[PDB]
């Protein structure tokens, strides 16, 4: 019913929302930690002062955003701000393939503004210090291993997005706060593994910015989190679809 | 339904437990801390033994209180409990111009009794070692950086309440726990930028018995927490008036 | 429609439940915090190594239960499971008198167990440690502090289950899980203050299993738990009743 | 109407989410805490930097990935994914005997994978330094001790499903969040005693894994996981079908 130019505004809205408010804390909490001890490597400051508390206050700034995002726009766009929900729904026949491209883009420029907004509010440390919280693999984690964590974990955000937001069956009025719960989980556990992106966009934004205002060079990890997001998201379409039929 | 004399009373009494609870815990945090050695300037002491877990923890000490405030006066008042919300409304034709300055008083004084009610229950050390959790840029965000925070996190709350409390198709019963949690998400992020207030009233309380009881001027900061939250709701309120048209 | 033999049954089983696991995670938290070095006397364990992120966690694991009793059990007596708020509903004609003494003696007994067997569960240092998470006014905290503290913090709990138990308005389904975060919002901001125990019951068990067990006597505090959350209770539901006229 | 084909293929998934993102959790907690300095032996590292709320952050990462799965495999298998809850049902003939067998064998088999697939994305540290989130008694705990703990929070699991869930009167929608987030509640308490399993097949997955990739064998407490849960959970199906006969 809403316009495509109105909906492609308020996709934009919601991945600006997404990343200003999600990669933000992260962004914030290494800034607090900043110049404090680690008991290891692979604790990089997230976890220094409140252990896993960290991660789930980080997935849960994120949760609660997108979850705000959804029950504010789903009745307008849909609420999508995510290439690979956009690109699972559309392997499905539930969205269509001619509003897939405005989609992305409204989303990957959302996501650049939001990191570039917030950086703009907490200062330069948001990038120097915090990363503008970009999404890479962690200390002793590989390319490989981080790719398989992006797919797990798509592939729960998407099956969930299937089952509470797209079925017909679906509990009215459940999908904004299961949707942006369920990320806040995923982060929990994955955040200290690749970041746990589970979204293109949410990836892009703080990787633009935090190559322009931070010198950071993040790119050659940028597959990762264009492919393992998507496949994750394609398998738990395909299989919500199968389990169902 | 209900006379606008109950009305202002079930305001006052919704601003004064938002106050009291959330300001509260934020207060707490920081007398438990005392004391301690922070890693750096930017971290003052909330965030210093939970880490991001102590902006989480404040943000859903305001948000629960918010729900609960919801859910018990929303069917009286509307529970706007915040200045911004109130013109917000107005400013899209969804409350009287007529009532906007009693709900304001309302809420003002609301917060001020709330503020000072738990300064009796915590002990002087609530204002002089807490600040009653009185909002003000933190070290090193300049005034502007704070405003842009205040518009940014009362935007993302006042567009949530258009979805979800103010369109007629938003899911019954949900917008309580959504507007409560949506304000836990945001002050987990800005917390530690601009304090997050999102409210005029809910900085107007701690700063008035900080004044009193603390001695603390921090009035030369108010007009932040003044301009920041109405534009943003504002804008927000147009936005999705826009959006949906 | 069910008997009063079972629905004491149930006010017994709800209320064991609420202690078990609330009363439960605060002596836990002192348990794995015992021997580490607070910053000052106001912070006694709970908060060293989460800071307000410990509060919110006990004050979670308080809401969580209290949310999946009020599921399980509402339907059977109502789940009062504290006796202020058994109280507070007698008050305005929402339950009968006859009923008020065999819930509280339910309420008290199914407290007293709930304590008892966590004992039996976490071994003798959760009494001696932890305290069995018994509710006392912290440290420089006065009498009539404590006092104040819970009738505000059960005012606020009981005006919201006026809102979204007791009146006919209320959304259905929501009950239960509001009433509970509400709960763990109220730990959060004055768990460090009194205890939070807006129960009587919920303060009989754990002193009574603590002075059977610990050889600790807080007897003397006893009053500060009854009249403040029946004050409290009473307040809100007439308030409630006011408003709503 | 699901196929029992699809139903099994169902449960193994929820129950390879349940093990990959909860006992994930707990891994990566002990893995950014390596290294650190626990004030007493009952802390094993999880709670070393943030105390409870390391604790309820694990079970919110279980709550939330629960959440997530019931409301995606609901309508399709009940989402079961816990032998107690498949025995429990059926002790009340709310599932029949004759697939009690097949669920189990595929919650099993769910779990060994989820751990599995876990131990490639974090790396072999998540074994010899996280166990994989084993459930075990903790320090100073006995077999009794925790054999109790497992049935007191299997009884509040299993009376919450029966009461949200099995019950024809129970609020639709609201099962997912609800168990998920009581599960979060029970492990935020129970965690540091046995380590809150509340189910045979979230144990069996990380022990076998753990036997495998760790060398620890800790099959010599998988009595513990079998008996506590599947008591208590036909406790409680036969305690609320009595106070609801």
Redesign the interface.
Known sequence: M?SLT?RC??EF?GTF?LV???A??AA??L??????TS??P??IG?????????????G??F???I???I??????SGCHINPAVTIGLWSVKKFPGREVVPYIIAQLLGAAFGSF?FL????I?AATVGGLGATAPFP??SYW?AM??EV?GTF?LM??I???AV?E??????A???IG??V???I???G???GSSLNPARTFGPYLNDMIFAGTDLWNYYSIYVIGPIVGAVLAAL??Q???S
Chains 1, 2, 3, 4 share one sequence.
């Open positions: 809403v109105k505004i308020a809205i929302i200003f408010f999600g933000g804390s914030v909490t800034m607090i930690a900043s110049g404090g008991p290891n692979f604790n997230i976890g220094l002062l409140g252990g896993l508390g960290d991660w789930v206050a980080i849960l700034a949760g609660f955003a979850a705000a995002s029950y504010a726009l789903g009745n307008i907004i703009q509010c907490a200062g440390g002793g984690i291993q398989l964590a797990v729960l099956i969930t299937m089952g509470i079925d069956r679906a509990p009215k009025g459940f904004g706060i299961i719960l369920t806040a989980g995923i929990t556990t994955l200290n593994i690749s299989t919500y199968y389990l169902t």
